[model samples]
Target chain A: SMKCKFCSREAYIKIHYPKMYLCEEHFKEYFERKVSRTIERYKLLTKDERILVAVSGGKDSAVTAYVLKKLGYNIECLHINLGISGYSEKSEEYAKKQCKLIGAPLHIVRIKEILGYGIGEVKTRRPPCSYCGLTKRYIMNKFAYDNGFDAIATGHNLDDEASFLLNNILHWNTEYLAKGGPILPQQGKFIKKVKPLYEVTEREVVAYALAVGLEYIVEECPYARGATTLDMKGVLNELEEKRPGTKFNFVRGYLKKKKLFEPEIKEKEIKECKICRMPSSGDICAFCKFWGLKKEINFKVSSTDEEP
Target chain B: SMKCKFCSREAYIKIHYPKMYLCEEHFKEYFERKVSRTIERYKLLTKDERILVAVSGGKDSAVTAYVLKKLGYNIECLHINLGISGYSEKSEEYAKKQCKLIGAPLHIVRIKEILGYGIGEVKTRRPPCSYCGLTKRYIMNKFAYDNGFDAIATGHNLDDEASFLLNNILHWNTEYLAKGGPILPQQGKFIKKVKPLYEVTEREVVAYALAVGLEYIVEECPYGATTLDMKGVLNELEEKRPGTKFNFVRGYLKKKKLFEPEIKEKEIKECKICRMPSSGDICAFCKFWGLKKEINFKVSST
Candidate 1:
């Protein structure tokens, strides 16, 4: 048996990074410490309050859903089926299977129902991720707000945050940088969104998923027009490999300097959609507009049908 | 030449920033504050520490060697001759003359003598100074050790360190980040290395060199363009958003502390090649330079 980094035991995972071979017991202990430290450090969660986690069914989110559930947090999962047939089906299946494995209730939202079109058709309008992200965030916010959940947790890892910060700061996207981080403060039904996995790298999550023997939906999404983050991810990860903790430090550094580059963020005032009377940035929220609920038209807001 | 504010001499640099037209005189004055104040604030040096300044005949090191000598510190100079023909000739001449001007003794370290091959013969042509920088650092450290030098200093400025740190922080390279910082921790058989002019801008360093009328070459290395361009972009950021450079650097150092304690526990071992402080069985520099001697990594990849 290879000796563990912390103790001499039958090592389960040979993470020769920072040159450690950890046994299952040690590995779990380490993962837990990381989780709680991140939670505490970012104030990612409200103790005992239920959380709504956005699960893409990708390994990243599946692990988030799994870890928080195993840790005994009250969490419900949401997955939006973009209706790309195979892609949506696989994503939905794994997200469901993931929560089921963890014994957490999973909620499914259909883009067809919400937007009156699938992602396949919607790509005709805007770019892939632009609409995809807008749709996911809008639905997630509404799901959390309507269901009275305190916050929304995402699967954004250090790589995503690091890549996004490079993009944002490179372009000096003040509004985006100022508002986005590990934990965004809540304002008027926008329901605070938190990334519990922000401190963890993508490789760590994938490794954890593998160590746990999870057959997650390891598929890249269809209709994926690669965001510049995809390119930035490669660049950043090269830095990370050449230097461990680069992603963490880069992200951490950006947040620390948040005070100096504080963008003139707009007041977090939410206007009611005239059609659905929901909290929106404008008279018609982008979600409803995507669904053809233009402000000039009358669209009754339907109460969400929830199942226990 | 722009217009020198203090005199009728031709203006060297038009700092559209601070709206100043600086000739060599006022420019030099402006620059001295930067280097001296940075050294004072970082406490990078003190009385009686025998500091070895690594001068490549570059403006940064020239200003660095000159500034610290004027600060009343006991300092010697070290220059590595990579034998890059015209580049090395100019670099060596400037390094020697600058040391003479500063009234500090200089030690010329030759790669051919130290490693039994000039950087040129090692590669059949001028090697990339990126790789050459590593060799320079290795020889400088060796010189610091051979003599009883307390500190080894380099010519890295704010733009240099900030860009390097930004490059590292962008990816999170722990090992490289550990190597960085104004003053590196003294490792086994390695002397302490400090950067006295780290907070000073490259432009200011050059201005200092000119203001003092120091003889130095102005030739850029063939591989220097990449990092030089990086500095240019960052300089834009610094001009557009003042303190971006300083904040960018300070933010990095602060962020590095998060990994410091855990990284400290990670073992350091002797490299199979250089027997230097390395994280792995083979040091990164040895691996990169393919310095598996006797073999000498003397061929192109198949």
Candidate 2:
């Protein structure tokens, strides 16, 4: 008879990290406690301020919405339909259903209505994922800023953040290493972006989503089929399996020590796009001109930013 | 037929980086040119300076000594005998042979004589590799300083450096990431240490050593059993995808530049125990071996 790890009861699930079997009640307790602790540790948000969480109807986003709502913070959900033919249809259904379950007011943005084309149309110039990301980022920020939220949150869990970090560090990408982390500081035209799920792994998030019976879309992004970041994620996940807590420890270690790279990073200059007024390293933002979306830039840039 | 990637000649070797196949003459030229270029790129040495190359009598160290001497720089070879019964003997023989081939003076240091025990005896505290590295690092700098050499050099090639960096980064070893690199500065009592073969790789060094007809000892440390270093892991990665290690090595140089400030804060100072350079009041090597100068008599007598 396998007992629950934290109590004298039948085990409900076994987790690889910390190598424990927990009953349903303890699992939920542990999961929610960890989410709250991560918020406190990173100082993500406060009780008074409102945060806009970018929910995409996936397990990560659904689980993020559930956990953040459980933690008792003023939250709003934004779902951007990237206008993929068959994919976006089911995604919008799940995003709508998830907001109903989580009891958060959902704001919907469609890429087809804003920009003349679905994500598939832009597939020739850029990959579907990249185009989708640019569209969602633009719309989400626009929505959050217009609504006057304090910060915008993303569903980037530990696996996502660590793999991206390892991918950047392996190539010695000075730009990404210097600029990237769990949270980006408020810069000119950029609201504070944070990842509350930064401490939890994707596997744990899936378990949390399943344990809570979250209704989320379970399809892989068609464009991420051959992405190099997938390879990085596989390597890191394999390493994590061999040695438990590797992803968390390595990323936390990076956050703890990556400040050493600030000297070289401080020299990099950012210039706002003349038309869109977004913070970019060029005279004109490349994304604005590339997709021919200059007329689509309706949101005004932020007032002030004091760079750290 | 895999023609020479560079010329219309039958290829003798194929390098993963750049996905190039080369004939014997061209490959040798590329190897030697890379070594010389690495030296120039890092400013590893000048004509006026005398440097000690830490040769393990293995392919990497032997090739480093050979190439540096061929480039017309004053080089001396120091081989540390860790007093591991069979290992140290063969290492010493190769150490003698490599110096003879390079026409450089060789100096030998025995661990059992100086430290009161062979490296194999110090097994309980740490792994064999860790102890050997710690001891050699301590004694080598002391030897170089005592001998008045301007700098100390090691046979660590790109694979070794990159693998070590990978291990450190995987564990988020900030201090090691910040302080560790191809060259450690000559802060206070610590002599500047450099790696002349920092750009070339282990497999390339082995190929160079064999092509040059240089005899080197082919023995793996009996103690490095089941080592999970980045080298072994990287080799597996390279098998999956070619040219990965080369990219990783170059990135490390950039990685080092970004992490330098964190390391500099530790500030190298003289150890109160042996007056050697240390991050703390007492150096790690001294603390590990408990070789610090004690007052001997108990203060209770006072």
What do the candidate models score in CA lDDT, each in turn? 0.72, 0.77
**In candidate 2, which residue pairs get closer than 3 Å at backbone N, Cα or C atoms, i.e. clash?**
none
- Classified by CAPRI criteria, candidate 2 counts as acceptable
DockQ of each model against the real complex?
0.09, 0.42
For model 1, residues A33-87, the per-residue Cα lDDT tens digits are 7887888897888668879889888888888878888777888888888888778
Across residues B1-302, which tens digit of lDDT does each residue of candidate 1 receive? 57788888887776543567877666767666666777777678776898989888877788788888877788888887887666787788889889988999887766665466656556535456556767777767766776778898888888888778666545446567666678876878678888877777777766677668787777566442545545655675566556777776766665454445335477868778766667788876677556775222111212
> Which residue runs of candidate 2 sit more than 4 Å off their true CA positions?
A7-13, A47-49, A122-128, A185-190, A215-218, A263-308, B6-10, B47-51, B70-74, B96-105, B120-131, B146-151, B185-191, B213-227, B233-258, B263-302
Please tell me which predicted candidate would have the highest lDDT against the true structure: 2
Query: What lDDT score goes with residue B133 in model 1?
Result: 62
Query: Interface RMSD (Å) of model 1?
Result: 8.5
Instruction: Rate residue B249 of model 2 by lDDT.
Output: 72
Model 1: colliding residue pairs? A240-B171, A243-B172, A243-B173, A243-B174, A244-B173, A244-B174, A245-B172, A246-B171, A246-B172
